[PDB]
Write a protein that binds this ligand. Structure first.
Ligand SMILES: Nc1nc2c(ncn2[C@H]2C[C@H](O)[C@@H](COP(=O)(O)OP(=O)(O)OP(=O)(O)O)O2)c(=O)[nH]1
Ligand SMILES: [Mg+2]
Length: 868
DNA sequence: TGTCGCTAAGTTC
DNA sequence: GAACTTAGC
């Protein structure tokens, strides 16, 4: 009778069906010897509300306190007579529950005997401010059904659940192959120590042509690659994809080149030719249903792909839209809106993976378009079909098949990108650590995960969580740096996860810090037992430490090393975000005083570490909120390491948990300003041998707002300034290279691609206030003006400053590379590139190096030294 | 409908 | 002296 299934996604509707939460997942079947999708609809998820008894009777807040004691019986009478009749509440169940409270609300006793009252969801809902003559507050009024079913039953992320006495549904309700009905939340439990099962992953790529007359989008080709056993606890499978399906729709106006039949016949029989977008979308929905994917993945799928598909279904009215999800409905969710919540609910029960958001979360790249990601991760070359060609692609069957194959190659690229970053296993692991639903975790953002993590930590520990909600404080300290160049060995010491360590050491928790509703609250007493937040932060720190130690294992494959690095970075970001959510003003657990205390202790620890290092009779040169750089004044490497170990031990002697480590050793240092330096890191190899690797932190060469010309010039200049050659030869080499680049630029030898300057928008092009035409925004608008895929917010736009005789300010002349390559009346701005893009970079780089000053650089570059 | 924190150099108007 | 952006912790 028991029914055991592994759950992935949960969907709820707080209005359509009240007190009903759906759990989608996989279940084992011996007949097919396979896992099949199923949906269990936990019904009768009774709403719960906790009423806080008062200390003494109050005459409806009019006569103030009267001194009459109030007990649980009086509270029950009051709720049964007045509140129940007033709010049209028929049946309710009451009990006394002793719970503790520590959150941002006044006059709520720390540990009190609340009266819990449960009533059916369908009945009306109490109001948040409801106050009677016997109680002063009601908690949990608006707690969503899904949240109650998750926290109460202790489910934390995808896992195996056991159901007692399942009931077959009277009529079909979901599109899955197995349906169960749970009549109460108490019949569902979680089973531990089992292997996660394989899932079905479908990567989709759609090529669309924008309608000329109607100024809208009409899909023309859709390809997808599906794997039926994509694991979630082992390495990605090779080959990544098992099978695929392609569909192509002839344009409403254009016609096939009298050879489409023969071309398709000689190519393959796995491609579906659709006469319209209606048939194409129907075929896509049928294939999705038959495959029943569990993770649909793509690029900008939340933003532009799923929304386009749903809108096209609505416009052409393709029947049975609900198949694009898992549930059965008739009223599509309203489109538009901010983010992709509407698009997410439009395919409920099917996790959605936008590789763009995952890549943003994990890796850092200059641009996030598909081409840049492909060139940066898989190290390939991605062919981009011009938007004009696609409309003209349906003129030769060869080019039609080429377009279809390009879509297929994009799909394969997306799947490989997903595999390499280990998006799915990492997402599942983070979801299990936090406790939220996987579909939300894969959508980015850290506030949700931290909120759910603390929610679990406090629910399992007998606390009452706060109701969902309907420069600020002193932060890090950066030491004043002694700018300049250093040739001896500079030792960089750093602290290990300084903020989580501070939280652990000083018991900075929710249940210990006696706040008072912008001062810094006093530190908690040591004798107090560990709180709720420190325990979770320590668990996360321990997981990160274990991953690091595993990385320390010698003879590890480079790819596995990259995977471990990504996982460790994700865990560090999760700990940092757990700290940060204490400062978010729009957070369930906003605790600004706690974040202020954490930052204040960090500043204190940094200042004390600096004091100790200085008292040790050495020289300090820099530090950013947890790190310190020391001037060794030595040359032998062994002495450097011995001094580092000595100082590390001396510093660590004063902290119970905090750890200081040798962040690095530098052979040559170039410290320009705060948060800007370059150095030659020294990695030992054995027998006293030490290899060198050039590391730049903060320079203008490592930012996407400078031309590649300036990037290469600064790279060479820094390479010289850091080497061991004598100063005179370094200066002469710099002069020769600068003259060479000047001659090349003046003669136009430099290629076009080295001129682009990239900037990322924050809002949409229109929403930007018309404050002049700040280059990127200007160029952005042009891209939107032309008939191509739009450039929405959070997109990298590349522009090149050119000349057209406009005689305007240099900023206003920003243009697009395609425009310049197309227009015959525009040309590159040589003086701009050699004056405001290269010279400032080299001048900042060579500021403390004797022998070079701004005038000399300007002269050597070929610029006129008049205005310099 | 949610969108981790603060700090700081650098460009533009 | 304010905005905007992109690095750094
Ligand atoms: N809220 C928030 N705080 C951060 C973030 N990044 C860094 N911090 C803060 C908290 C960290 O404890 C502190 C120092 O960070 P580090 O870069 O030195 O990393 P960490 O010390 O955790 O590890 P490490 O041993 O130095 O490699 O800066 C972040 O992304 N968000
Ligand atoms: Mg650190």
């Amino acid at each position: 009778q028991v029914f055991r299934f592994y759950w992935l996604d949960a969907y709820e509707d707080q209005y359509s069906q009240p007190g009903v939460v759906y759990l989608f997942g996989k279940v084992w079947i011996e007949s097919a010897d396979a896992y099949v999708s199923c949906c269990v609809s936990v019904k009768n998820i009774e709403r719960t509300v906790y009423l806080l008894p008062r200390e003494n009777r109050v005459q409806l807040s009019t006569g103030k306190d009267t001194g009459a004691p109030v007990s649980m019986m009086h509270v029950y009478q009051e709720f049964n007579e007045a509140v129940a009749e007033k709010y049209k509440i028929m049946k309710f169940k009451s009990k006394k529950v002793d719970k503790d409270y520590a959150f941002e609300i006044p006059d709520v006793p720390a540990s009190s005997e609340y009266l819990e009252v449960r009533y059916s969801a369908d009945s009306p809902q109490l109001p948040q401010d409801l106050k009677g003559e016997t109680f002063s507050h009601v908690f949990g009024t608006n707690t969503s059904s899904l949240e109650l079913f998750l926290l109460s039953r202790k489910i934390k992320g995808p896992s195996w659940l056991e159901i007692k006495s399942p009931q077959l549904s009277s009529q079909p309700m979901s599109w899955c192959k197995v349906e169960a009905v749970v009549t109460r939340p108490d019949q569902v439990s979680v089973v531990k120590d089992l292997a996660p099962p394989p899932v079905v992953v479908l990567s989709l790529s759609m090529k669309t042509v924008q309608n000329a007359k109607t100024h809208q989008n009409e899909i023309v080709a859709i390809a997808a690659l599906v794997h039926h056993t994509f694991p979630l606890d082992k390495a990605p499978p090779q080959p990544p994809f098992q099978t695929h399906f392609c569909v192509l729709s002839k344009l409403n106006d254009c016609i096939f080149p009298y050879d489409y039949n023969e071309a398709v016949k000689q190519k393959n029989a796995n491609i579906e030719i659709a006469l319209t977008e209606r048939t194409l979308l129907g075929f896509f929905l049928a294939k999705i249903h038959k495959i029943d994917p569990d993770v649909i993945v793509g690029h900008d799928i939340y933003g532009f792909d799923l929304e386009v598909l749903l809108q096209r279904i609505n416009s052409c009215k393709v029947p049975f839209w609900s198949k694009i999800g898992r549930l059965r409905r008739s009223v599509m969710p309203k489109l538009g809106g901010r983010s992709g919540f509407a698009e997410r609910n439009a395919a409920c029960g099917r996790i959605i993976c936008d590789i763009e958001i995952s890549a943003k979360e994990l890796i850092r790249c200059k641009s996030y378009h598909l081409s840049e990601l492909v060139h940066q991760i898989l190290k390939a070359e991605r062919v981009v079909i011009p938007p004009e060609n696609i409309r003209n692609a349906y003129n030769d069957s060869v080019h039609l098949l080429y377009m279809l194959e390009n879509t297929w190659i994009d799909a394969k690229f997306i799947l490989q990108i997903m595999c390499e970053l280990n998006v799915l296993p990492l997402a599942l692991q983070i979801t299990n650590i936090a406790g939220n639903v996987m579909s939300r975790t894969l959508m980015g953002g850290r506030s949700e995960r931290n909120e759910y993590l603390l929610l679990h930590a406090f629910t399992e520990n007998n606390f009452i969580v706060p109701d969902k909600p309907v420069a600020a404080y002193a932060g890090g300290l950066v030491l004043e740096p002694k700018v300049g160049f250093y040739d001896k060995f500079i030792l960089l010491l750093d602290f290990n996860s300084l903020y989580p360590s501070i939280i652990q050491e000083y018991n900075i928790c929710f249940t210990t810090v006696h706040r008072e509703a912008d001062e810094i609250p006093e530190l908690p007493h040591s004798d107090l037992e560990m709180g709720i937040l420190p325990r979770e932060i320590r668990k996360l720190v321990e997981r990160r430490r274990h991953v690091k130690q595993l990385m320390k294992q010698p003879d590890l494959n480079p790819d596995l090393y990259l995977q471990y690095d990504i996982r460790q970075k994700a865990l560090k970001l999760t700990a940092n975000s757990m700290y940060g959510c204490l400062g978010f003003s729009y957070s369930r657990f906003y605790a600004k005083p706690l974040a202020a205390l954490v930052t204040h202790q960090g500043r204190e620890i940094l200042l004390h570490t600096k004091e100790m290092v200085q008292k040790m009779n050495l020289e300090v040169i820099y530090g950013d909120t947890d790190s310190i750089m020391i001037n060794t004044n030595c040359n032998n490497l062994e002495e450097v390491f011995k001094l580092g170990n000595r100082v590390k031990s001396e510093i660590n002697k004063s902290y119970k948990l905090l750890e200081i480590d040798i962040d690095g050793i530098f052979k040559s240092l170039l410290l320009l300003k705060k948060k800007k330096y370059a150095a030659l890191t020294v990695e030992p190899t054995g027998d006293g041998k030490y290899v060198t690797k050039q590391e730049l932190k903060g320079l203008d060469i490592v930012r996407r707002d400078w031309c590649e010309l300036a990037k290469q010039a600064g790279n060479y200049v820094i390479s010289q300034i850091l080497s061991d050659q004598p100063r005179d030869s370094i200066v002469e080499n710099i002069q020769k290279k600068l003259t060479e680049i000047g001659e090349n630029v003046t003669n136009g030898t430099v290629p076009i691609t080295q001129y682009e300057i990239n900037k990322a928008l924050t809002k949409d092009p229109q929403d930007y206030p018309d404050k002049k035409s700040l280059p990127h925004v200007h160029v952005a608008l042009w891209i939107n003006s032309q008939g191509g895929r739009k450039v929405k917010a959070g997109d990298t736009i590349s522009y090149v400053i050119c000349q057209d005789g406009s005689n305007l300010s240099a900023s206003q002349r920003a243009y697009a590379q395609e425009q310049l390559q197309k227009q015959e009346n525009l040309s590159i701005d040589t003086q701009y590139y050699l004056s405001q893009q290269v010279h400032p970079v080299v001048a900042r780089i060579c500021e403390p190096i004797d022998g070079i000053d701004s005038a000399l650089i300007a002269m050597w570059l070929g610029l006129d030294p008049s205005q310099f």
